Design an enzyme around this catalytic site. Structure first.
Site, PDB file in Angstrom:
ATOM      1  N   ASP A 133       3.285 -11.532  -3.519  1.00 59.82           N
ATOM      2  CA  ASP A 133       2.636 -11.805  -3.830  1.00 59.82           C
ATOM      3  C   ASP A 133       2.295 -11.966  -5.534  1.00 59.82           C
ATOM      4  OD1 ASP A 133       0.715 -14.509  -4.949  1.00 59.82           O
ATOM      5  OD2 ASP A 133      -1.270 -13.644  -4.637  1.00 59.82           O
ATOM      6  N   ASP A 285      12.058  10.986  -8.660  1.00 62.79           N
ATOM      7  CA  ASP A 285      12.003   9.614  -7.867  1.00 62.79           C
ATOM      8  C   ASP A 285      11.184   7.956  -7.751  1.00 62.79           C
ATOM      9  OD1 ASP A 285      10.178  10.088  -6.245  1.00 62.79           O
ATOM     10  OD2 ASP A 285      11.879  10.939  -4.522  1.00 62.79           O
ATOM     11  N   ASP A 357     -27.323   7.558   3.795  1.00 62.01           N
ATOM     12  CA  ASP A 357     -28.589   6.747   3.841  1.00 62.01           C
ATOM     13  C   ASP A 357     -29.243   6.750   2.332  1.00 62.01           C
ATOM     14  OD1 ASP A 357     -29.543   9.156   4.117  1.00 62.01           O
ATOM     15  OD2 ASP A 357     -29.901   9.116   6.234  1.00 62.01           O
TER      16      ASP A 357
END
Ligand SMILES: [Ca+2]
Ligand SMILES: [Ca+2]
Ligand SMILES: [Ca+2]
Length: 408
Positions: A133, A285, A357
């Protein structure tokens, strides 16, 4: 390093602004209440199963990605109606925005863009991932600056596992054609705007937009095309502390290593864009990863004749790691300097991630989640060295000390 939470999103983030509307939900700007870092928050409505299945497919793909031209995913949230992705915040600048204003790109500037797009496709295909896409709307510039890199920001139709690869190639040809003449193809036809564009550019477009998928060039072929090599041809300058940091990274404790990786993930395009630029220059590369050979050849090119034994040790550590290459964020984590990262505001970022938490203290259960057996050994060694309280947990003062100590 990407955790899923089930708590309330708004407990950790302030929703500062609505940024836009996607196909499956909105995108917001969020501010971390503790760290003051900015993120893009992508909301995905779990209304239908076909869509819900896409959402998790995307998450699993994005967890695998680490590339200079691909948007970062930091964490996710999920409740009954929605899934949220906490992502890197880019600019609102679309790829074709400057065309609306100023007309077609020069070939030099178009090549600069195409090299980034080609590199991202190569990286994805090398992971056996197809995007499927790659429309212009799925890109955003990372900042408003003219020097900004381009990022792919959506992987909603991407698939882990071809005719598919050839479609990604085709999509890149549509973009290239549009950059060079300022209108989409078929609405290869070279007319009034193409009379001045180079035969190299025409030839590449011709290879990318070959009607028969089987005759279409591969991503490697596009990257090695004379249009790319000539137009983007440019020399690499190391930072003063790069090699020192690189050789020291392996000997840091495991918590500090993860902390640097998180810090690197947040500063890569600004405070340490020097290091990012060095990575990209070394990655000849354009694979989005560095081999020991790329680093060696790079250093030789810079002027180092006899590579010192401790640098040879880094090279061998790379060869012998999980894959034989070092990833983008790992390179940044290993090279970033304490002058950049040793600041309470920076170190709070990884601390808040570890302190799940929000206790203000990092517990053993939290570390167990962080470190993915002999993992208990590592936790023990960690706490022995870092827990100067004896209370069995790590607070921010103890964390800051750990980040600043010189002794391994
Ligand atoms: Ca490479
Ligand atoms: Ca805690
Ligand atoms: Ca403690």
């Amino acid at each position: 390093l990407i955790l899923c939470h089930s708590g309330k999103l708004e407990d950790k983030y302030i929703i500062d602004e609505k940024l836009g509307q996607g196909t499956y939900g909105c995108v917001y700007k969020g501010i971390d209440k503790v760290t003051n870092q900015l993120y893009a928050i992508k909301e995905e409505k779990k209304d239908r199963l076909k869509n819900i299945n896409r959402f998790f497919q995307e998450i699993e793909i994005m967890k695998k990605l680490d590339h200079p031209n691909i948007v970062k995913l930091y964490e996710t949230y999920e409740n009954d109606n929605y899934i949220y992705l906490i992502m890197e915040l880019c600019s609102g600048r679309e790829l074709f925005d400057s065309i609306i204003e100023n007309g077609s790109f020069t070939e030099k500037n178009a090549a600069t863009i195409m090299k980034q797009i080609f590199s991202a496709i190569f990286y994805l295909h090398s992971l056996n991932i197809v995007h499927r896409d790659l429309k212009p709307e799925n890109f955003l510039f990372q900042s408003e600056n003219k020097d900004s890199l381009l990022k792919i920001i959506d992987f909603g139709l991407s698939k882990n596992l071809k005719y598919d690869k050839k479609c990604d190639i085709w999509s890149s040809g549509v973009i290239m054609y549009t950059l060079l003449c300022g209108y989409p193809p078929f609405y290869c036809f070279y007319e009034n705007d193409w009379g001045s564009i180079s035969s190299d550019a025409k030839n590449l477009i011709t290879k990318l937009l070959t009607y028969n998928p089987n005759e279409r060039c591969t991503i490697e072929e596009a990257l090695n095309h004379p249009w790319i090599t000539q137009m983007t041809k440019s020399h690499v300058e190391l930072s003063s502390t790069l090699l020192k940091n690189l050789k020291n990274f392996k000997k840091e404790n495991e918590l500090k290593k993860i902390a640097l990786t998180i810090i690197a993930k947040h500063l890569c395009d600004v405070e340490i864009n020097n290091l990012r630029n060095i990575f990209i220059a070394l990655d000849v590369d354009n694979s989005g990863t560095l081999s020991s050979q790329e680093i060696l050849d790079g250093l030789k090119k810079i002027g180092y004749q006899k590579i010192p034994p401790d640098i040879h040790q880094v090279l061998r550590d790379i060869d012998s790691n999980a894959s034989g290459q070092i990833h983008y964020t790992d390179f940044l984590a290993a090279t970033i300097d304490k002058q950049t990262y040793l600041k309470k505001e920076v170190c709070l970022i990884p601390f808040k991630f570890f302190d799940i938490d929000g206790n203000g203290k990092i517990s053993v259960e939290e570390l167990k989640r962080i470190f993915g057996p002999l993992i208990d050994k590592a936790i023990d060694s960690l706490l022995q060295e870092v827990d100067l309280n004896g209370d069995g947990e790590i607070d921010f003062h103890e964390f800051m000390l750990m980040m600043s100590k010189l002794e391994h």
